[PDB]
Swiss-Prot record:
<dbReference type="GO" id="GO:0140684">
    <property type="term" value="F:histone H3K9me2/H3K9me3 demethylase activity"/>
</dbReference>
<dbReference type="GO" id="GO:0005721">
    <property type="term" value="C:pericentric heterochromatin"/>
</dbReference>
<keyword id="KW-0805">Transcription regulation</keyword>
<feature type="binding site">
    <location>
        <position position="200"/>
    </location>
    <ligand>
        <name>2-oxoglutarate</name>
    </ligand>
</feature>
<dbReference type="GO" id="GO:0035861">
    <property type="term" value="C:site of double-strand break"/>
</dbReference>
<feature type="binding site">
    <location>
        <position position="235"/>
    </location>
    <ligand>
        <name>2-oxoglutarate</name>
    </ligand>
</feature>
<keyword id="KW-0862">Zinc</keyword>
<feature type="binding site">
    <location>
        <position position="270"/>
    </location>
    <ligand>
        <name>Fe cation</name>
    </ligand>
</feature>
<keyword id="KW-0408">Iron</keyword>
<keyword id="KW-0539">Nucleus</keyword>
<feature type="binding site">
    <location>
        <position position="300"/>
    </location>
    <ligand>
        <name>Zn(2+)</name>
    </ligand>
</feature>
<comment type="function">
    <text>Histone demethylase that specifically demethylates 'Lys-9' of histone H3, thereby playing a central role in histone code. Does not demethylate histone H3 'Lys-4', H3 'Lys-27', H3 'Lys-36' nor H4 'Lys-20'. Demethylates both di- and trimethylated H3 'Lys-9' residue, while it has no activity on monomethylated residues. Demethylation of Lys residue generates formaldehyde and succinate.</text>
</comment>
<dbReference type="GO" id="GO:0072562">
    <property type="term" value="C:blood microparticle"/>
</dbReference>
<feature type="modified residue" description="PolyADP-ribosyl glutamic acid">
    <location>
        <position position="16"/>
    </location>
</feature>
<dbReference type="GO" id="GO:0010468">
    <property type="term" value="P:regulation of gene expression"/>
</dbReference>
<dbReference type="GO" id="GO:0071479">
    <property type="term" value="P:cellular response to ionizing radiation"/>
</dbReference>
<dbReference type="GO" id="GO:0031490">
    <property type="term" value="F:chromatin DNA binding"/>
</dbReference>
Amino acid sequence: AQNPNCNIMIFHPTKEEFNDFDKYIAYMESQGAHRAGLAKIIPPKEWKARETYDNISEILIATPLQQVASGRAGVFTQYHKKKKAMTVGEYRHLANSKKYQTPPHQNFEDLERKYWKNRIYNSPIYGADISGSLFDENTKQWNLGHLGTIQDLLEKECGVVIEGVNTPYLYFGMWKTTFAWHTEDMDLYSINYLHLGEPKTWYVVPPEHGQRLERLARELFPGSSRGCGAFLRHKVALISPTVLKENGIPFNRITQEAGEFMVTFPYGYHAGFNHGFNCAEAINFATPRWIDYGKMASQCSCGEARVTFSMDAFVRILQPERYDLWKRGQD
Ligand SMILES: O=C(O)CNC(=O)C(=O)O
Ligand SMILES: [Mg+2]
Ligand code: NI
Ligand SMILES: [Zn+2]
């Protein structure tokens, strides 16, 4: 078995190897990459997502989110308070302000220490889930707005034709902006490209150990657990590496820098934070190996997680029994 310790793998495709997306994903899995839950892909040196970022300030963040924390430094929840709309230009200025900017630090490790020590005492502002793309239409390789769609994968593998579309989303982050512990909708893959700015640190639990994380989460957030049988789908809970180590949960960490892709694999729980002002683009995708994870994916039926038009069809076809009760939570 390849990659038996479930380490995060880093790949350096040639421009020749960067032409066929599906084939490269299947290559990485041949080498065991999926066992970690997360992989890094460094694009060929000749490749570019676009010519420059010089004119992005006019993108609108219609609902910036202030991420308010509650709990203790290593075990907290976050709630997203909606703020007034601002442009990317206004957001970048805010991120660079004395109140919100990255503090002085020695290296990524000192900064990680400062994040876990101090996150709860601040409320950084996140521009999340903004439909759109920053890839130039002329970028033919690994363009997240030109991937084959999950609906087309389900059609090719299973023969069924369903409604829905699959498009990317932009994320604008600042120091301390945080993504809570989660897997993707329907335990899909994701791919995330860091277009510009400061790094993003990731934590990930191997898929084969995801239930260990869930059992810890039920112990640490007991009333959330009683309220919903899949409350990590609400994307509100954080658990530090120190706490994970104290409770024997297998995990890994890695820092993504500007110009790099990350792939998350089905049922790979992940969480993380941003080091300073940045812009990432991400989209879900599927492969044939995903289908069985889609069938087995947990769902939020308490009604908090409240998910897409396109996820409806996935639930209807892959989880017909749940269909019913799940759409009661989503209506
Ligand atoms: O970048 C972020 O804020 C969150 N991204 C992801 O969870 C992802 O790409 O799966
Ligand atoms: Mg613009
Ligand atoms: Ni994710
Ligand atoms: Zn729920």
